[PDB]
């Protein structure tokens, strides 16, 4: 499932089984974290996972001409808390064939709740799988009921033709 | 707002400024209603609406070979105190590049509530605009609670290349 804009640019992408082995790799990388709700690890040493993510995005996208991935990878933990609609300050791109996305990979899918809600004038989207969504859109991290929730977030800039 | 599946077949279309040219004509068509919850008017001597719908679909849908429009219109009004449920539609096309859709054009929008909400194991979409979705999906009409919600339904059948 992928979502496009009226201009033609891709805005949202929903993954099902694309991130399988890198899930275990990210789990192993995140094993070295001590009591952090949101911890950012700059990743330029073991760039193998970054190369795999770049190749996956190159093969499973449309008309992609270049891909740029930020080195740092952030990890977030969630407990039965509230959270709210963390809007983005209307990041407006400059060109017309370029877009910066946030990619979220689920390390421990919550049993109940923990769905990334996305707000758009034409309609809302609620999902529980790995996501790649535009920084322009406004997202909410809905509260969980049972179980924990761990996510890995990356910033990726792509260009189209 | 384009939506595509893993095969590349378009599934959901969200028109914002597309049908706000014939909406008055649909309103005049709806006027001939006599206390029917869901009236399936066989409309034949109004083919101008069909022609404009076909033109819009041909122009704003990508990679189109033929659009087969059906010659009936179903007006459904949803009472504030009337509730609904799932639909659980089981239907699979027998060919590759072909899909039957359901075009919902809003004639009387509600003040709040009662959006059309669509199910999928990788995301749910809630919307209150002009929607066009395939018959392979289970959908729900949410409980309206303010005002009235009267919609017009066509039956689409599109074959691509």
UniProtKB/Swiss-Prot annotation, chains A, B:
Name of the protein described by the UniProt record: Protein C10
**Which family does the record claim for this protein?**
Belongs to the poxviridae C4/C10 protein family.
Q: Where are the transmembrane segments?
A: none
Task: Provide the disulphide bond pattern.
Answer: none
């Amino acid at each position: 499932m992928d979502i496009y804009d009226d201009k033609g640019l891709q805005t949202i992408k929903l993954f099902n089984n694309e991130f399988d082995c890198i899930r275990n790799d990210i789990r192993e990388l995140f094993k070295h974290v001590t009591d952090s709700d949101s911890i950012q690890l700059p990743m330029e040493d073991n760039s193998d996972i970054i190369e795999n993510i770049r190749k996956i995005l190159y093969r499973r996208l449309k008309n992609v001409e270049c891909v740029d991935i930020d080195s740092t990878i952030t990890f977030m933990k969630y407990d039965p808390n509230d959270d709210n609609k963390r809007t983005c300050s209307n990041w407006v791109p400059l060109t017309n064939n370029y877009m910066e996305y946030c990619l979220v990979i689920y390390l421990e899918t919550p049993i109940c709740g923990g769905k990334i809600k996305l707000y758009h004038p034409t309609g809302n989207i609620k999902s529980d799988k790995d996501i790649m969504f535009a920084k322009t859109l406004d997202f909410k991290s809905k509260k969980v009921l049972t179980g924990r929730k761990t996510i890995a977030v990356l910033d990726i800039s792509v260009s189209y033709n």
